[PDB]
Design a binder for this molecule. Structure first.
Ligand code: ADP
Ligand code: ADP
Ligand code: ADP
Ligand code: MG
Ligand code: MG
Ligand code: MG
Lengths: 327, 519, 330, 49, 339, 354
């Protein structure tokens, strides 16, 4: 999109790929190709101009494809920790008032992730999600492309109901099922979803973590935000990714395990938590899904520490994060 | 074209389609919609566009090579060696076509002596009216009115034409509306099983082109051929429509066109044609709320357009009783079906005998006797007088269409009993059935009667005199004076006085029917 | 008659016509990629007159487009890969019906459903009523029957009628030939009168304590200017005179101010307010008593009769067996 | 079907009511064979004015 | 395919299974062996097992009634924070000829069959959909609430007549769709609000609801013992062949039948159910529930490897029917579930 | 489709934007604030990019609400005539598909192709939306993507793209009650959600006050314009210096002491100013931040009047953008305090009403 002139549309080219170069690139990837530019003599329907016309194509010979998260945005440190945990791995939703930069966090997440997709609303609605048949081969949408990656969705509440049902299916079941005239398939989508929205029981019941961002007009916080924004606009750099990608890749290689003893402690905590939730009649949801989310967060933190056995600090930090999100 | 039947289908498989070819005399038979056995040969015929990839092919055995300037290249070499692609398809040639299971004089001659004996034995039985009800519907409990209506629709009336070029309907249409689980689809399924030419369709499953007809081009000649829809295959038969409310409004418009004109007009692909659709329609519909509302008329309980509503001859309404003893009587039958798979049935006539008798009976065209004219006139007069204000509101309102329906039902009864003329028994039966189909709205009558009497008195006072009028006390005294010959004691008199005073207060203040003025 | 008289004229109703819309539309031909535009009733006329019946029945899209069509005389349509601006220089002559079906004088406002925005674009507004005149009906009937009789023989109703062809050609000639502009002396008088009219309108709004449904804006001043210019053009003159502006202001008053100010109506409102309190619900009053009571107050009898007729139309008043005494209902 | 040559072009807009004086003729593009799956008509040349 | 052939040469296994069947607790053991990684919900697993066994496929063509549905359709209504989805996944992965649909993702034409033309040859007039491929199998429907009325119209005929009728241009046919349905549903508010009644919470037409054999109202009691057991099990998460052979043998070797005692027990159960369900607020009863009771009794008879249905089977079926709807705890005159 | 500019700018400084605002359109009477805002659109802000690929918007957006006959459409038409890339798109004239873009399957090849809408064609340009209130909700949700980031994301199975749509928007919408009600708060009259209001940089409310002297002035101006005739055309007929020559009627006898700028020089100067790239100074950053905090605290102090638009994080960017636009107006190298003061005056006027 950077190289397109003013008011025009991106142009396309066709590449042919040989033996070992085959199976290197996947749809949606950014690639650099070393190739030879050659024509093809065309024989077919008659044309206006006499002579020898041809079609061009490219023959390839080589194809080549805590830390600070979005340091430009001030505040939201706990949300940034939760985002780090979601990137590392073992579904996060943000609801906020307008004027708080929720879209920019999703943009940063899309840029950071190796496999990622970013959707803005009705522009990618329908066939942009799921998949469709084209001349026959089946081509997938954003959810299919982001398989084993992270997906980002903006203005979630404005989406059509069908898209929301598909998103719920992806979050819970992790596969898509399509049964329409001409299509009868099940698609694999092992991707984690980050969603943004404006101010429901569905989000609380289905999602794992919800972050509510309320703009309370405190003078000190607003003044510091103004100072940070002026610094950003003037010096074009925050006040004083490859390493982050390599660190995440090294981290995901390991898989910690839960010992037998700590279970009792965890069990106790869970019970007590639910008891408190039963004491506070204004509370809304506690279920085994919350315990599963806590276990997954603790395993992710243990993976961050590269420890073989889950430890106490990870469980405490997961409990604190869930408490902060709920409050 | 022929198709594999449903009974031969394996698991999860679409029926197989085959092409059959008729030569010379056998060409006549095997009309569309039949279910027939073929006897012949299985023969291989070449095809053209089967092989998108190269396959088996022919060539010549001569050891011939090319010469310079005439080298056997692609096209010239293939043409020189006479190479042909070996592609084939399977085609069936038929030499014998028979019905799988087999002009009144012709029908009589076709039947054997034993079949005619059985037909005559059936003919002179009054229990034919009763036993046919139980034979076709052994398992369904109760609802004998619906069984009688379905039988009358099956036998049908007589079509006629007038001297002005108009035509009069001879068919009967039936609709059933009921609460859930009142065996409503069982009647449709039983009629589909019994009838030889019947099509059962759901509301949303059948498309517009699925009904009516389609036009396609002939394979060899320049002419065109017509693919028959559900209504055309059910011509002079019965068409069953379940979930009648789910049909699209424009599909309902097409259905109403077929019901009124009894003709389908096609103007497509350079072909203009008119085809006959003399079908009788049996339809099932659900109430809007899923249950019948006893406090509202029929027009307020169903989402159907007025024209098609008026076209239907008979409407039947089924309501489930909550805790009557019938719950026992129903259960005894249902388990009897599960405990006794086939031994719990006491049919009087086999279905084939019934079909033969129906085929013989449909040929008759009875006339209308002289006394029947006056009897029908007086019965219609009584039916219309039933609509008077002296009784509660009814679901229907009676028009001339009810008179024509009565005539059609009389003709159907005469056809069923094979008599040569319409006689008062059939008229009485049709009158009885049409009255029993009508259901009165239940919410009151006494209040309405008192209000009407008061209105009549006040308006007579207003119209008869330009002088002064009376007051409330005068009205009460007048009504009591008129009742004086009807109340024997003071207690009843005072109770009725209190009741009428409260009723008058309600009329003046709540209903606003009567106006009150000061001195 | 306007449609026939004007050199270019289109007669339409609300929602367009049988097979022609009121505004233009744009489509793309899929086989051969061409941007096709369908002529509407407004685009088909340029410099002509568009007569519009049933102004109330218009659809939403046409209603929005007609705002620009009336104001800037252009329509703007944008679709995928195309943006176009079409010219529509039409004069508008519209007819409409009452909200209740017939006019109700005492109700004053709320008899017109149009919002003030669309009503602002009009230059002059006329209100016509079925006025009771016993001796005028005889003249109307005689005129109608005389027309019916004389239509068969001679088309010479008036001595000095301009022939339709001559009138058409003369109108075209005057429109094409020259164009006039105002004069400063008349301009200052027009300014003074316009300021006075605006002041009176504001005073009326403030005193009546209700927003006027037919406002007086700059567009009405330009409308008076345009009417004076048209009167000047009718005589081929390059500059108008005081008399033209005086006639224009007379017409503008008679139409617009009588429409917007809709003592007779206020006095009828006073009578209605008095009667509503005096009338006892569920009681009878003799018409003679009401007539005496209001004539002792020295109000005209015709106003009382009209108020009683309007109440009869609404249904609050009913006659007894003898029409001498009425009673009140709701 | 009508044939217009030289200055007669663009003198008529679709929708106009016209009176036309002309010569009744047939097209002449050689003795071509009939086409399509319908070949009933024999010796028929398309006509025009 | 293999059931229709005499390949039970393993007389050792036959004897072992026939001896196992005589043991009393085997029923519960089967409910225990159906899913090792699933929680204390034994009633749900028992219902799924009875679904697996299925009712007897009687022949009623001579009667003229038509086909009689011999299979079991089950519904699970509850909050999203439960394990119904895992149950559907396990049933899909366990049984051959299984299909899975979810909410609005499927259309009315996507099911049944649709018109096609071959990309390789000239024509292939009709192609089967999701339901027909599930013939003699299991179809698992999730997010049943979001499905439109157009697809529910198809489901109405599929769930009862076991057949489909298609009438389009040049295509008139009847197909077999002998499937068994496992449906999942959510409350309208995504919470089981106790102030609203059961019918108001579910928000489905009674015609659709009546055809389900069993309805499981998943509710959260917040018991401490439940919390401790589930937490311990879930954290601790950090013979199949014998079951397969037994299920195949029972499914392919025995035809259940019932005597007059079972008949009268069924009739008594039916009238009692009608008495209980008469009150408004709760799901009313219909005659199809009698057939559902018959099917469950026949499945339970199959479990015990018995050709004769005893009163024990009918009583167990009645117990399951009563417990699934939670009619015992539910207030009969207000339609509100209590604890 | 140099010395003069340098001398004029260096000599005038503040008088540059003063005269440009005053001489924007003689055909329109008064409304200095709206003329200033339109000039700010014409000059615009500065697009900025950083290391992480972050994008910061630099365009301005305005919404005008007023009584009928306040010449909003005249302003829109003038901006269409003057701006280089200007496209008019009314409320129901164009739908959501024709605004941004669409995807079509090419029958000739079977591929997927992109067709650009109104906003994509108007890259670095102006889109004018008359009768903005009649636009449907979904179209405004679609316009959100263009108004926030300036890009359009498009996707259908087989193709997906991010098209550039950096643009500025004018919009005019009628009040819900036909005429603006004085007593009711502006929130009831506007009838728009807070998110959409935050999307716009400026809100303006225009009223037709019937003051006799104001009406006299309006009548004088209108009739002076009406009586005017083009020089060189005979009466009664049918149908470059930096400063415009004085006219007896178009300007008046009193205005002889001042002059108006010619249109051609105005366009040349606007283009040159749009080219110039100013920079923000340290003096004004703290000043603007303190005033933003002052406004967000005054939120409690403004008790006698209501607020037209909510104050969010976008307000600070709007302040900086207006400051940079004013710095563009007078050719220089850095943003000064006077531009910040002018921006703050505009914000104070637009954001609150009596
Ligand atoms: N905490 C913050 N730090 C820096 N900039 C912010 C912050 N919050 C908001 N912003 C600015 O405000 C704007 C918010 O717009 P956007 O993120 O599109 O809102 P939303 O995502 O709610 O639609 C962004 O351009 C961003 O530069
Ligand atoms: N009166 C009855 N006699 C016998 N069986 C009945 C009766 N009423 C209902 N049933 C049984 O209940 C079921 C009713 O379902 P169905 O008729 O399909 O309902 P609907 O047609 O209203 O959708 C049938 O399977 C039938 O066996
Ligand atoms: N301030 C003003 N200066 C000059 N003319 C004006 C002014 N305000 C209104 N007008 C006149 O009033 C008319 C208003 O029409 P229009 O611009 O369509 O109003 P709106 O856009 O509010 O509907 C214009 O023709 C214009 O000549
Ligand atoms: Mg955003
Ligand atoms: Mg049914
Ligand atoms: Mg305007």
């Amino acid at each position: 999109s950077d190289q397109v002139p003013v008011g025009n549309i991106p142009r396309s080219i066709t590449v042919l790929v040989e033996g070992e170069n085959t199976r290197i690139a996947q749809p949606g990837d950014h690639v650099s190709v070393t190739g030879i530019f050659l024509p093809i003599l065309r024989t077919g329907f008659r044309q206006v101009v006499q002579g020898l016309l041809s079609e061009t194509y490219l023959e390839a010979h080589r194809i080549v494809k805590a830390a600070s998260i979005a340091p430009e945005i001030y505040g939201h440190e706990d949300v940034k920790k939760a985002l780090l945990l979601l990137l590392v791995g073992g579904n996060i939703c943000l609801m906020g008032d307008p004027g708080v930069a929720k879209s920019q966090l999703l943009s940063y997440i899309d840029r950071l992730a190796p496999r990622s997709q970013y959707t803005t609303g009705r522009g990618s609605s329908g066939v942009g999600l799921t998949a469709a048949v084209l001349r026959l081969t089946l081509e997938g949408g954003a959810l299919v492309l982001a398989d084993q990656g992270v997906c980002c969705i903006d203005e979630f509440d404005k989406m059509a109901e069908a898209d929301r049902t598909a998103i719920h299916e992806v979050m819970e079941q992790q596969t898509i099922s399509i049964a329409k005239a001409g299509i009868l398939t099940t698609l694999n989508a092992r991707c984690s979803i980050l969603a943004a929205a404006n101010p429901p029981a569905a989000l609380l019941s289905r999602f794992d973590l919800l972050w509510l961002i309320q703009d309370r007009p405190d003078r000190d916080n607003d003044l510091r935000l103004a100072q940070h924004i002026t610094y950003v606009h003037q010096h074009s750099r925050q006040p004083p990714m490859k390493l982050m990608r390599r660190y995440i890749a090294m981290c995901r290689e390991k898989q910690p395990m839960v010992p037998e003893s700590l279970a009792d402690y965890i069990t106790a905590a869970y019970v007590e938590m639910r008891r408190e939730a039963w004491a506070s009649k204004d509370a809304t949801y506690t279920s085994a899904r919350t315990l599963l989310a806590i276990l997954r967060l603790s395993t992710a933190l243990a993976r961050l520490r590269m420890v073989d056995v889950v430890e106490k600090e990870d469980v405490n930090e997961a409990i604190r994060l869930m408490e902060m999100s709920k409050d | 074209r022929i198709q594999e039947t449903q009974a031969e289908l394996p698991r999860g498989s679409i029926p197989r389609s085959l092409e059959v070819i008729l030569r010379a005399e056998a060409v006549e038979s095997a009309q569309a919609g039949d279910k027939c056995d073929f006897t012949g040969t299985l023969i291989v015929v070449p095809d053209v566009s089967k092989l998108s990839t190269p396959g088996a092919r022919a060539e010549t055995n001569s050891r011939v090579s090319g010469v310079d300037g005439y080298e056997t290249e692609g096209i010239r070499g293939l043409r020189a060696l006479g190479v042909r692609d070996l592609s084939y398809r399977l085609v069936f040639l038929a030499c014998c076509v028979a019905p799988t299971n087999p002009t009144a004089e012709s029908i009589k001659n076709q039947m054997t002596v034993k079949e005619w004996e059985k037909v005559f034995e059936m003919s002179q039985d009054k229990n034919l009216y009763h036993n046919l009800c139980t034979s076709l519907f052994p398992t369904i409990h109760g609802n004998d009115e619906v069984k009688r209506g379905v039988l009358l629709m099956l036998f049908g009336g007589v079509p006629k034409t007038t001297g002005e070029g108009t035509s009069l309907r001879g068919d009967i249409n039936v609709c059933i509306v009921g609460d859930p689980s009142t065996a409503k689809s069982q009647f449709l399924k039983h009629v589909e099983e019994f009838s030889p030419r019947a099509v059962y369709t759901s509301g949303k499953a059948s498309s517009a082109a699925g009904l009516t007809a389609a036009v396609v081009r002939d394979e060899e000649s320049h002419e065109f051929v017509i693919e028959a829809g559900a209504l055309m295959l059910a011509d002079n038969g019965v068409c069953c429509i379940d979930e009648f409310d789910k049909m699209d409004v424009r599909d309902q418009v097409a259905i109403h066109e077929a019901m009124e004109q009894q003709t389908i007009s096609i103007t497509k692909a350079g072909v203009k044609a008119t085809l006959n659709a003399r079908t009788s329609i049996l339809a099932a519909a659900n109430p809007i709320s899923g249950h019948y509302d006893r406090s509202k008329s029929l027009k307020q309980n169903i989402n159907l357009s007025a024209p098609i509503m008026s076209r239907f001859d008979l409407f039947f309404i089924l309501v489930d009783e909550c805790n009557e003893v019938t719950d026992y009587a129903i259960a005894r039958r249902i388990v009897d079906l599960h405990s006794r798979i086939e031994e719990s049935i006491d049919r009087v006539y086999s279905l084939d005998d019934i079909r033969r008798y129906l085929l013989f009976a449909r040929q008759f065209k009875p006339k209308i006797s002289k006394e029947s004219e006056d009897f029908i006139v007086e019965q219609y007069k009584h039916l219309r007088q039933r609509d008077g204000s002296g009784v509660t509101k009814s679901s229907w309102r009676i028009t001339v269409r009810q008179l024509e329906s009565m005539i059609r039902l009389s003709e159907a009864m005469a056809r069923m009993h094979c008599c040569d003329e319409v006689q008062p028994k059939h008229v009485k039966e049709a009158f009885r059935l049409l009255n029993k189909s009508i259901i009165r709205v239940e919410t009151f009558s006494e209040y309405c009667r008192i209000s009407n009497l008061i209105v009549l008195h006040l308006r007579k006072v207003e119209e008869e005199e330009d002088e002064s009028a009376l007051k409330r006390s005068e009205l009460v005294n007048w009504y009591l004076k008129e009742i004086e010959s009807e109340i024997d004691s003071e207690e009843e008199l005072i109770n009725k006085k209190r009741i009428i005073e409260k009723v008058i207060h309600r009329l003046t203040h709540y209903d606003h029917v009567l106006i009150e003025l000061t001195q | 008659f306007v449609e026939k008289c004007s050199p270019i004229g289109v007669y339409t109703s609300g929602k367009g016509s049988s097979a022609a819309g009121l505004t233009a539309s744009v489509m793309r031909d899929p086989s051969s990629r061409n941007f096709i535009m369908e002529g509407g009733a407004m685009v088909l006329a340029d410099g002509g007159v568009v007569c519009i019946d049933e102004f109330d029945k218009m659809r939403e899209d046409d209603r929005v487009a007609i705002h620009e069509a009336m104001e800037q005389q252009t329509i703007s349509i944008a679709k995928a890969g195309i943006t176009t601006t079409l010219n529509s220089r039409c004069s508008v002559l519209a007819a409409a019906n009452s909200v209740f079906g017939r006019w109700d004088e005492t109700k004053g406002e709320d008899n017109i459903d149009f919002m003030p925005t669309i009503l602002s674009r009009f230059d002059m507004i006329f209100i016509v009523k079925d006025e009771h005149n016993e001796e005028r009906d005889v003249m109307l009937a005689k005129h109608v029957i005389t027309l019916h009789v004389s239509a068969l023989t001679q088309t010479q109703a008036v001595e000095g009628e301009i022939d339709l062809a001559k009138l058409k050609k003369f109108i075209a000639y005057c429109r094409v030939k020259c164009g006039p502009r105002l004069s400063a002396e008349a301009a200052e008088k027009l300014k003074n009168r316009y300021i006075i009219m605006r002041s009176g309108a504001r005073q009326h709004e403030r005193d009546s304590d209700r927003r006027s449904s037919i406002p007086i804006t700059v567009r009405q001043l330009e409308a008076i200017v345009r009417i004076a210019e048209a009167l000047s053009k009718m005589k081929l003159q390059p500059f108008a005179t005081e008399a033209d502006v005086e006639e224009a202001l007379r017409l503008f008053q008679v139409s617009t101010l009588d429409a917007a100010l809709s003592e007779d109506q206020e006095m009828l409102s006073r009578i209605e307010k008095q009667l509503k309190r005096r009338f006892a619900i569920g009681s009878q009053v003799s018409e003679h008593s009401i007539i005496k009571d209001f004539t002792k107050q020295k109000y005209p009898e015709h106003a009382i009769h009209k108020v009683l007729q309007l109440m009869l139309r609404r249904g609050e008043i009913q006659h007894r067996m003898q029409r001498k005494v009425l009673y009140r209902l709701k | 079907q009508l044939y217009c040559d030289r200055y007669l072009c663009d003198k008529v807009v679709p929708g106009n009511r016209v009176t036309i004086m002309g010569i009744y003729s047939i097209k002449k593009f050689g003795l071509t064979t009939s086409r399509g799956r319908d070949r009933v008509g024999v010796g028929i040349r398309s006509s025009y004015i | 395919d293999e059931e229709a052939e005499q390949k039970l040469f393993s007389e050792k296994r036959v004897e072992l299974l026939k001896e196992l069947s005589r043991k009393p607790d085997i029923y519960e053991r089967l409910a225990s062996a159906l899913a090792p990684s699933i929680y204390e919900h034994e009633d749900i697993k028992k219902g799924i097992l009875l679904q697996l066994f299925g009712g007897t496929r009687k022949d009623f063509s001579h009667t003229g009634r038509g086909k009689f549905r011999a299979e079991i359709n089950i519904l699970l209504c509850g909050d999203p924070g439960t394990s119904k989805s895992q149950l559907l996944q396990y049933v899909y992965n366990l049984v051959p000829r299984g299909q899975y649909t979810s909410g609005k993702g499927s259309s009315a034409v996507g099911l049944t069959a649709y018109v096609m033309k071959d990309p390789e040859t000239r024509q292939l007039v009709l192609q089967t959909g999701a339901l027909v491929l599930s013939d003699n199998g299991i179809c698992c429907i999730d997010e049943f609430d979001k499905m439109n009325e157009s697809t529910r119209s198809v489901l109405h005929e599929v769930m009862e007549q076991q057949t489909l009728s298609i009438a389009k241009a040049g295509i008139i046919c009847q197909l077999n769709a002998r499937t068994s349905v496992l449906a999942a549903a959510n409350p309208i508010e995504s919470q089981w609000n106790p102030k609203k009644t059961t019918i108001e919470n579910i928000q489905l037409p009674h015609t659709l609801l009546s055809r389900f054999d069993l309805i499981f109202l998943m509710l959260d009691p917040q018991d401490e013992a439940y919390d401790r057991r589930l937490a311990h099990h879930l954290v601790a998460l950090y013979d199949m062949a014998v079951l397969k052979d037994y299920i195949a043998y029972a499914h392919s070797t025995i035809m259940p039948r019932l005597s007059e005692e079972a008949s009268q027990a069924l009739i008594e159960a039916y009238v009692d159910m009608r008495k209980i369900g008469s009150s408004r607020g709760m799901v009313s009863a219909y005659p199809r529930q009698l057939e559902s009771l018959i099917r469950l009794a026949e499945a339970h008879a199959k479990v015990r490897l018995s050709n004769k249905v005893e009163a024990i089977d009918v009583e167990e079926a009645k117990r399951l029917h009563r417990e699934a709807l939670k009619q015992s705890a539910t207030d009969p005159r207000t339609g509100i579930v209590d604890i | 489709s140099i010395a003069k500019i340098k001398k004029f700018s260096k000599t005038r400084s503040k008088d540059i934007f003063d005269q440009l605002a005053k001489s924007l359109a003689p055909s329109i009477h008064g409304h200095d604030y709206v003329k200033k805002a339109i000039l700010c659109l014409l000059l615009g802000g500065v697009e900025r990019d950083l290391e992480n690929g972050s994008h910061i918007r630099g365009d301005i957006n305005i919404l005008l609400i007023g009584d009928p006959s306040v010449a909003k459409s005249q302003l829109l038409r003038y901006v269409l005539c003057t701006a280089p890339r200007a496209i008019p798109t009314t409320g129901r004239g164009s739908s959501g598909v024709g605004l941004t873009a669409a995807v079509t399957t090419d029958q000739e090849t079977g591929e997927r192709r992109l067709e650009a809408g109104a906003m994509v064609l108007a890259d670095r340009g102006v889109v004018c939306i008359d009768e903005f209130d009649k636009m449907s909700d979904m179209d405004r949700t679609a316009i959100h993507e263009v108004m926030e980031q300036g890009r359009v994301t498009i996707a259908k199975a087989g193709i997906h793209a991010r098209l550039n749509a950096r643009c500025s928007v004018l919009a005019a919408a009628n009040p819900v009650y036909g005429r603006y009600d004085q007593y009711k708060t502006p929130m009831e009259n506007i009838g728009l959600q807070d998110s959409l209001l935050s999307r716009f940089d400026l809100l303006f409310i225009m009223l037709d006050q019937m003051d006799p002297e104001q009406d006299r002035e309006i009548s004088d101006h209108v009739l002076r314009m009406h009586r005017y005739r083009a020089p060189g055309e005979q009466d009664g007929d049918a149908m470059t210096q930096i400063y415009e020559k004085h006219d007896n009627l178009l300007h008046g006898t009193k205005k002889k002491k001042e002059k108006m700028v010619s249109a051609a020089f105005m366009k040349k100067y606007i283009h040159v100013a749009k080219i110039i790239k100013p920079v923000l100074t340290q003096e004004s950053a703290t000043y603007i931040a303190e005033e933003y905090s002052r406004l967000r605290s005054q939120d409690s102090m403004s008790s006698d009047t209501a607020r037209t638009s909510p104050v969010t994080a976008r307000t600070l960017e709007t302040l900086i953008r207006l400051a940079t636009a004013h710095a563009k107006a007078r050719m220089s190298k850095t943003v000064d305090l006077q531009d910040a003061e002018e921006a703050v005056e505009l914000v104070q006027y637009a954001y609150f009403k009596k």
